[PDB]
Amino acid sequence: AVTCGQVASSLAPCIPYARSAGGAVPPACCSGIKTLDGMARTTPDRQATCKCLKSASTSISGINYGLVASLPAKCGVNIPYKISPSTDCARVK
C-alpha cells in the first residue's frame, strides 16, 4: 500500500499553493498529483492516501479546502469527487 512518506513526497509541492487564494498551479504540484494518482490504483491505496492527508491536515493551518478540492482537475486529472476533510476515509472507493 502507498505510505504517508510517499503521499507527502508527491503532494509536498502543493502545500504553499494549498494555503493561497488560488491562481496558477505550480507544475511540480500537478506532477506530484499525477504521481499520487499513479500510486493510488486500489481502494485501500486511496483510503490510505485519505488517512495520510487528514493526519497531515491537523498539523497545517491556513488550508483553502475549496481550492484543494479543485486541484486535480486544474492538473488535468479527472476525479469523481472533491477532496474534503468532511468525507470519511472508510467510504473512499
Side-chain angles (χ1 to χ4, degrees):
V2 60
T3 69
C4 292
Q6 287 170 319
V7 172
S9 189
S10 61
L11 300 194
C14 297
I15 285 157
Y17 182 82
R19 289 186 67 255
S20 80
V25 190
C29 164
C30 286
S31 282
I33 287 159
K34 281 171 167 149
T35 302
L36 191 48
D37 189 50
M39 281 176 172
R41 309 205 194 205
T42 70
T43 300
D45 288 332
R46 288 184 285 266
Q47 293 184 339
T49 299
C50 178
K51 288 175 222 175
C52 293
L53 286 183
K54 274 206 195 172
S55 190
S57 297
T58 71
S59 190
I60 313 179
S61 53
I63 298 184
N64 185 354
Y65 288 110
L67 174 65
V68 165
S70 66
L71 254 179
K74 293 181 162 196
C75 287
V77 186
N78 203 337
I79 192 169
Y81 306 116
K82 323 188 178 205
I83 318 170
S84 173
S86 192
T87 303
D88 299 332
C89 298
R91 304 199 153 87
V92 166
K93 301 318 181 218

